[PDB]
Symmetry: C3
């Protein structure tokens, strides 16, 4: 006595009378806490994770960046707007700011009589 | 010789002498592996997760996209700049590249003579 | 009793005959479920997480936004395109839409 342990319905491993079982974490992403006074074990996910990828339906975040299926991609090579409009853009003020359509139309109306 | 098991201080049950306990993963997001050679069970977070949402204070990543609270968002429908400028934009040269303000100013300038 | 329980090979205690062991989660981010009176326990990551940060090599997601090392960032201050082109922009039609180079060239040609 002697109880049987299974994991994911694998085979019995006996934990015998006077025997032992060790529970361990594979990485810093999973915390397992126990002390020497009580049997109690607490498991948790780290609040700062290190991951290879995350899938959220058509949204993927990975080591290269953010990808949305049939949508934008954001990587170290830059922003791909996904063949979609970019909306909510404040007017550009510096040479290296994006311009919005209101700015383009102002210059169009000027150039036609300037 | 039995022993009593609770999970989150609940669902109290006896694991009797000769009885059995299974520990399983609810999904691919959490890996659990037994090594019966040394009576160890290792637990870890998968490095590739499938999730519904992540909240980091005002930042949300979910199945629709990336959201900054009251600010920019990136979804399949496109990028919303949040009524802020888009900075650090290089000059467009292909049809679907964004235009920066320096390009608009160059065209405004070149039509002085013409 | 009894059998010996360690975590990461440390903190041994004896789960004695007639003793008790509790397995609990430390936060809402980890789900541990016992199947009632059944001796099976399931562990999983919550599908909705609350985190401080995630690092994926040079990509960081945190409470400020999304950052790519040597690349763009997206925060409450706005989007920085990383001193690089923005590609794949559909033509703007409303006042606050971005405009693409084809639109700029169209107006250059018209004059």
């Amino acid at each position: 006595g002697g109880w049987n342990l299974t994991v994911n319905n694998d085979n019995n491993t006996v934990v015998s009378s006077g025997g032992a079982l060790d529970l361990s974490s594979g990485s810093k992403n999973l915390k397992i806490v126990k002390d020497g006074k009580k049997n109690n074990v607490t498991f948790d996910v780290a609040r700062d994770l290190t991951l290879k990828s995350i899938k959220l339906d058509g949204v993927t975040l990975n080591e290269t960046g953010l990808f949305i299926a049939n949508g934008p991609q954001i990587t170290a090579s830059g922003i791909n707007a996904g063949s979609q409009k970019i909306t909510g853009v404040a007017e550009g003020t510096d040479a290296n700011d994006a311009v919005n359509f209101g700015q383009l139309k102002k210059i169009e109306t000027e150039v036609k009589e300037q």
